[PDB]
Amino acid sequence: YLDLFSHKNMKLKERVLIPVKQYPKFNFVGKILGPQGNTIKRLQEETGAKISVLGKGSMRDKAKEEELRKGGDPKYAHLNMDLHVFIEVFGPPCEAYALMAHAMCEVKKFLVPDM
Amino acid sequence: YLDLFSHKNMKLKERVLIPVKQYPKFNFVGKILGPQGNTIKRLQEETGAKISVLGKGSMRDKAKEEELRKGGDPKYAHLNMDLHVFIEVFGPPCEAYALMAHAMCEVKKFLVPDM
Ligand SMILES: [Li+]
Ligand SMILES: [Li+]
């Protein structure tokens, strides 16, 4: 059950696949991060969600990625996953759902770019 | 992972406790259903969610409830639960989250009535 008077926040998290198969040559990583990561910065500010691009190719740098994978450091474990966008929100339920709805809708625009 | 090109819908479901302890004398069932259940009818149409009031007291009729519990029919199993509102939405992710956000926000107005 959700309890609207609880002192815990809700967390919502989603990992949305970047559709590399549907759009094999589209540079989603470049488009989502934007120059110096300003697009994703703005995306987070406008939606109030934490949003990261994770998985292989998320760093646009085959060689850097390979080197951070091979170090074995668990913070880079995500570099073996499928490329995806990771959205995380927290709050009381009404706010969490609303933030996730907003984030999910904005992210969907980037991931279905010919819509 | 969510796959935006999958043919499956997402389902989201929440059971939100009606806060009988915070408001021990407020008739939430009457207020939510409305005369002939028109309020909840309209609530569903406006939000696009399925919304039901379930659990003990959901029928405003101690004796009817007791009689349907005692028959043992599984469709009335919910009459032993804590009184709550049950929200269910389905769709592709952007739509599901947005419908749930809307439903959850409207329902919260009814359940925190002195806000
Ligand atoms: Li297309
Ligand atoms: Li109060």
CSV table of N, CA and C and ligand atoms in Angstrom, one decimal, chain A residues 22-23 114, chain B residues 5, ligand 1:
chain,number,residue,atom,x,y,z
A,22,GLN,N,16.3,0.2,-34.1
A,22,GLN,CA,15.3,0.9,-35.0
A,22,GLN,C,16.0,2.0,-35.7
A,23,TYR,N,17.0,2.6,-35.1
A,23,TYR,CA,17.7,3.7,-35.7
A,23,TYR,C,19.2,3.5,-35.6
A,114,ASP,N,11.8,10.4,-35.1
A,114,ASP,CA,11.1,10.7,-36.3
A,114,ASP,C,9.6,10.8,-36.0
B,5,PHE,N,9.5,0.3,-28.4
B,5,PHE,CA,9.0,-0.3,-29.6
B,5,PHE,C,8.3,-1.7,-29.3
C,1,LI,LI,11.2,5.2,-38.1
